Symmetry: C3
Subunit: 318 residues, 3 copies
Amino acid sequence: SAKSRTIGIIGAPFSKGQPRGGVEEGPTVLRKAGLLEKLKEQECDVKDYGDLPFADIPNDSPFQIVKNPRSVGKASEQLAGKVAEVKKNGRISLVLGGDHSLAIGSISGHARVHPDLGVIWVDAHTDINTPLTTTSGNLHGQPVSFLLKELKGKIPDVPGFSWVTPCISAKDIVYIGLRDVDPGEHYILKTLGIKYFSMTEVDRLGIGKVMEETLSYLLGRKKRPIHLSFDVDGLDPSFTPATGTPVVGGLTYREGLYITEEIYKTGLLSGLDIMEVNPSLGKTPEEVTRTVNTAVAITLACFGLAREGNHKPIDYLN
Amino acid sequence: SAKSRTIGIIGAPFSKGQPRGGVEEGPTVLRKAGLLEKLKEQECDVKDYGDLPFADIPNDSPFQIVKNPRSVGKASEQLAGKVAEVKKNGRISLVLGGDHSLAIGSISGHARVHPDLGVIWVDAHTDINTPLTTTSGNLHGQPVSFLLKELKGKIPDVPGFSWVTPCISAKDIVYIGLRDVDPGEHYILKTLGIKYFSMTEVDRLGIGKVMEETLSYLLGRKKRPIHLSFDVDGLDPSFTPATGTPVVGGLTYREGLYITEEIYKTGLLSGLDIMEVNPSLGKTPEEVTRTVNTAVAITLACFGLAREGNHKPIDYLN
Amino acid sequence: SAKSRTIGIIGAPFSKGQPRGGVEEGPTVLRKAGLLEKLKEQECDVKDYGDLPFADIPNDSPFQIVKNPRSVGKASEQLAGKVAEVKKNGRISLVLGGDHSLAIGSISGHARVHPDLGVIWVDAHTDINTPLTTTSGNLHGQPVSFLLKELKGKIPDVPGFSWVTPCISAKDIVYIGLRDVDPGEHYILKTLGIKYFSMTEVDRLGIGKVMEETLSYLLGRKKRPIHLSFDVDGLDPSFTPATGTPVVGGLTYREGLYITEEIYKTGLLSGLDIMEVNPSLGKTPEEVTRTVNTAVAITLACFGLAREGNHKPIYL
Ligand SMILES: [C]N([C])[C][C]1[C][C][C]([C][C][B]([O])([O])[O+])[C][C@]1([N])C([O])=O
Ligand SMILES: [C]N([C])[C][C]1[C][C][C]([C][C][B]([O])([O])[O+])[C][C@]1([N])C([O])=O
Ligand SMILES: [C]N([C])[C][C]1[C][C][C]([C][C][B]([O])([O])[O+])[C][C@]1([N])C([O])=O
Ligand SMILES: [Mn+2]
Ligand SMILES: [Mn+2]
Ligand SMILES: [Mn+2]
Ligand SMILES: [Mn+2]
Ligand SMILES: [Mn+2]
């Protein structure tokens, strides 16, 4: 019942942040996999807040090229209200997600309770396109732009995103696993001086130094809450094939566990997003089972499960 | 040949330390792949001491929940005498194994001739449950507890193991590759302060520094014979799938060869166990061939094979 | 475009340096995957010098055990000629290869214009067998032996290789990825003191320290042109299965990109070989697709593609 193992589960069955349908079943397959039980199998305080209901906005006309903006803005608006609710209740928010546009609400609602948070973004992509730089028009590739304070005056008024007040600065976010960056995204990345560890860096330094540099960069000045937004495609498709945008050359299964293991040991985890699990895009039933089983193992390591073993505070020899 | 390449081969077709049948064929398939001939091709002096006849023990009721204790204890007792015999002949004992419970006999008979030995234990598991902390009753996940001096007093009188005397100390064994550890094992691991590199530590430091710390921890004070107990499930199941208890996220083929190449270069390899190859557990015939090939390759690196190249002390240009 | 992105492309559909047919289709499948256009989409100045026509030599009698000496010798002689020409045009020679015996011509022609070049050899093998140390007799395992000045006199007079002049010293080549070396090659490797990073060294040091030590070893004294000879079997068969001699335990896709990404940032890439892609050696159509696409990615990384992203100095 430690703070590190005190959890509030929020389901976010949302998919309109991206074209490929099925990512809304994310919260369903993760629950079906036995996540809450396996969390309770560890010494975890688990309270389920259910699946957020998302109202179907039938006529959600696009903003220029950005599609379904009112639907994405409302879903994140509900998530922000719900995330802050479980944070004021002392629990670590565990958003069980569809597409990564929900990171707007998850981080915002987290920010209303802990405005001094830092963000670790595990992803293959930066998701830092603005509504003017996007070529896909999909909002799951834009959430960071709505959330950075330095990007104010650059974000046009998108219908449904009026409640969005930027809550993090460029110095309070670190990327791990980038290997598919748009040209506009790369421009923002280097112009803001955002700390990132692309797969070039992970190869160069190893996931060991990557985590060492990541945590000290974020927890150097002061100790502050950590929000980990984990996009399942941050790991190689050989472990998470059932996702919207897979890119080869990703983080290994071991590296994904080591990231989450090292973040748990800081004791400062405060919010978690497990996004972009799509049980429709599995070429076989095993590809979905493999993806879900991987996202579950990632989450369990976020809350104490260590590869070296775990044990309760008793004498097992008596 | 030289001392590092003078080998005495002991087939150990025993399976009653674990539930799944077939691991007794381990010696058969390893020989069939040509392990003897490939060792001789790299200037090894190899003597084949034959496959040990393990007489049937029909009345072998369980000790509490521990299964087949007398068959396991006598096979390890017979292996212990056999290993000590080849060590007295000046040869490196090579045990081609069934289940890992034979390590009780492999290490004990080794210690009888070389009581100052150190153990490197490559495995996904710690194999350190006592007959009382075990929940599976399978003796192949208990051999280390029988061998540790610091556990004297916690091993009950198990039928078949009255010959057993703990021969190695807690500071004379190093684990590499752990990722599947029972809570009672984790308690024992930490309380006795055993040196270990789980998959987490291998991810943090890399196999290069792991082997540098391993060999310095064991050989730093004084040089001494090394005993390597290699469980095949220490590597990832993508390389050794034909094994009893495969666990995802293991050491790679490269990492397995680097461990064994580094151990050879010390010139202090004295005993070697190649355990848990179960040719009946491959989902396809190729998976069996792939497991055996990896096992043969790791055995060949133990006795001189190097990826950088090998050559005889002659003038290849005449 | 900039020097590091101005390329002359040479297709070398040659296979008679090795016994498995199909590697001559390397240039065809690589073009077919759109390699040229993909290079142009990242602001590269691409000039296509076409595929080299290799005439058939009927009376190609063996030189002892060495097979097809006059076809291999003439093919590399032509490639050396065409590589010197693109080098004279101030372009980076990109050789879309068949078997690795063509490196005899690629490096010789490159050394004709830049005799101070340094070679990086990404390969599971050393390819340093002499015509007398070889047991296979396949010349795609002998190219480095013809190129090293320190082995002059150890190489017999082989028909087809009278034009060859040893053009690099053993102190100017760095091997990366070794894991299958013949006894005679390893003797040569140790005797001549060639700098090398086998899979053992990549395991021990990591790909980052290997690249830093490689670039420092070749360019520490002074800037000079770099010739990258990339045998596709340097990567693990799980990423490049459609090749003649797959060896397990190879460089990862990531390590291949990292090597090529780091080589680009020096701005000194001057010659490139993409060798030993054999589309007829894939057990499934996907295995061919995987091998080519991996080869394509390694190539684009040699000319600026970066996993962290790219952008023109234009976006806000
Ligand atoms: C190819 N580019 C043009 C589009 C590309 C598509 C996939 C998304 C993935 C977002 B996530 O990693 O959260 O699934 C990012 C992207 N950059 C964009 O902006 O839509
Ligand atoms: C998971 N627990 C419940 C049991 C677990 C099963 C697998 C064995 C592996 C033995 B070996 O390393 O020889 O393959 C170890 C184990 N600890 C035990 O004690 O049987
Ligand atoms: C088996 N050994 C004895 C021979 C071996 C076969 C494969 C070639 C690979 C050439 B390449 O690296 O260009 O694909 C090297 C080799 N040394 C030789 O010389 O033929
Ligand atoms: Mn994302
Ligand atoms: Mn095991
Ligand atoms: Mn074991
Ligand atoms: Mn090769
Ligand atoms: Mn080659």
